Amino acid sequence: IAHGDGRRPNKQRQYIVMKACNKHHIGAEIELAAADIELLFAEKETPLD
Amino acid sequence: FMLSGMEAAKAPQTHKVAGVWYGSGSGLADFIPNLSELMDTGEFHTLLTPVGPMVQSVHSTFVTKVTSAMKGVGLARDEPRAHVGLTLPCDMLVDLDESCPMREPAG
């Protein structure tokens, strides 16, 4: 906005802004017993099995 | 431990246990009459080939059948789907990595 005092005039301006992503990683560890993975595949024998 | 003849206080715990599984120590030394002489020239370590942990022992009166495990994890006989781990007495084993830390790499 111009005005009538002795101040210098104002040229038009421009602003240029740069933004970027941030990478984030997540990890969880599960252990499964070897007998538990095995007997999911072993065959049915009896009602107690 | 019984064929060696080492003293009591250097392995204070298994000396009681290995004294009750065996006699005075001459029940086994009658098989190897050269234990006085295998120790002099030092040929005893060239006559042991380490084999691995037990898996199963079928015991009879005069003869015991022993099945060991080489190359890896031996499969357990009586408990199914199990794995026989190796047992050492706490007395013989000397741990070697021990620090306050007062840092060593994991692996």
Side-chain angles (χ1 to χ4, degrees), chain B residues 72-97:
Chain B
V73 186
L75 188 66
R77 293 287 186 272
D78 296 330
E79 291 181 354
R81 303 291 186 269
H83 292 280
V84 174
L86 171 136
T87 70
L88 298 178
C90 297
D91 199 0
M92 298 295 172
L93 188 144
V94 175
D95 197 5
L96 198 59
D97 48 351

